[PDB]
């Protein structure tokens, strides 16, 4: 196996477990506290606030160590972040049908299992920037990195479809714990694979404030996106559609199930604008084919019947190409201009404007839960599309 299909298939193989355990998680904390919402609510809360304040140590870090314990800490911090969620997700679901849920010991157990989402957040967070951001353009040439990226994301996309199926299937919470071992088991041949190009190549020689490098603006246009609940597998924006546009339940599932289709054209449509218009162009095409699809599609939001709901799905449904092909070039372009020595430093500002973003569009759900407030988080979702727009093409004067 060629370099760049061996950093492709331990991808593939950790993606499919990681999005498995992703999407039990909050069905599983459906059964241990049934009724209540808040709780799968309140531990996503804490996974991102954890992750948010241990991102810019973590970010230093990957700069000041080698490459092979970048790795080594990266994998197997989830590895036994996962671990240890089996075992408080085992020990919650036994105490509660022996009729303890009102007690301490279920509250140490949550912040535990909290804790290690904390960490497999983390770990997941240091290999992301490590092989798709470090290992990823000093092992492949430049000129074939938006082929890498290209099959980076059909990755994603085809382990994000195949997950409610396979795990699904196997889902007294036993279904839960092979969904773990999958996991488990998933992160072991990349870390190798990941180890061995380290051991035999030139990437054991490398030598080991923030926003005010001019990448930030690079950054910032691509975090802005995150501020919208214009997405196919928005909780808000699903609710909406089911009591205000009293839409049938079947279609709305349908509207969410094309996100990852729409999002696998972007992987057709990205690289051949790149090949023709190169990747500067292309992202700006894409970016702003996302604002004018958006900006079509709010448009018919208000006003505003019951006949324009599918122009506001359909062009929804369109962003999402533009989207995902911007997400591509944003991403190429930190491979290629930031430095070496500050690939671990930079890119945690990245997965901290938008992990930011995200802690924002939480605050935004909770402040904002009425069905008849949705209509000015389209507006500010717009807006900050169009914000993203501006931010990128000033940037992109370089
Ligand atoms: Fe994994």
Redesign the pocket.
């Known amino acids: 196996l060629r370099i760049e299909t061996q950093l492709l298939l331990g991808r593939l ?6 999005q498995a ?1 992703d999407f039990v998680v909050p069905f599983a904390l459906l059964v241990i506290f049934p009724g209540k919402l808040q709780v799968a609510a309140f531990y996503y809360l804490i996974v991102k606030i954890g992750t948010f304040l241990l991102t810019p140590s973590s970010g230093k870090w990957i700069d000041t160590h080698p490459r092979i314990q970048v790795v080594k800490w990266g994998v197997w911090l ?1 590895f036994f972040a ?1 671990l240890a969620g089996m075992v408080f997700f085992g020990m919650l679901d036994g105490l509660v049908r022996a009729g303890g849920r009102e007690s301490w010991l279920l509250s140490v157990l949550f912040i535990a299992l909290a804790l290690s989402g904390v960490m497999a957040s983390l770990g997941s967070q240091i290999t992301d920037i490590s092989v798709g951001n470090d290992l990823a353009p000093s092992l492949v040439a430049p000129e074939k990195l938006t082929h890498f990226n290209s099959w980076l994301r059909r990755i994603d996309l085809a382990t994000e479809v195949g997950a409610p199926i396979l795990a699904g299937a196997l889902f007294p919470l036993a279904g839960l714990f092979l969904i773990g071992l999958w ?2 088991v ?2 072991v041949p ?1 870390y190798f694979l990941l180890r061995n190009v380290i051991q035999r190549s030139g990437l054991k020689i490398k030598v080991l404030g923030s926003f005010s490098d001019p990448i930030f603006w690079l950054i910032l246009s691509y975090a802005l996106l995150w501020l919208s609940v214009l997405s196919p597998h928005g909780v808000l924006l699903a609710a909406y559609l089911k009591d205000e546009m009293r839409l049938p339940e079947t279609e709305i599932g349908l509207f969410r199930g094309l996100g990852a289709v729409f999002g696998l054209i972007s992987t057709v449509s990205f690289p051949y604008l790149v090949r023709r218009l190169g990747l500067i162009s292309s992202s700006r095409w894409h970016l702003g084919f996302q604002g004018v699809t958006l900006g079509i599609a709010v448009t018919a939001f208000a006003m505003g019947s019951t006949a324009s709901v599918y122009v506001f799905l359909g062009c929804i449904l369109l962003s999402r190409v533009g989207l995902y092909g911007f997400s591509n070039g944003e991403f190429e372009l930190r491979q290629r201009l930031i430095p070496e020595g500050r690939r671990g430093e930079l890119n945690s500002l990245s997965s901290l404007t938008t992990t930011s973003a995200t802690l924002i569009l939480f605050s935004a759900g909770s402040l904002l839960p009425q069905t008849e407030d949705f209509k000015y988080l389209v507006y500010v979702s717009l807006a900050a599309v169009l914000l993203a727009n501006v931010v990128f093409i000033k940037w992109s004067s370089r």
């Open positions: 193989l950790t993606r499919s477990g990681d355990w989830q996962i996991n488990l998933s992160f990349e």
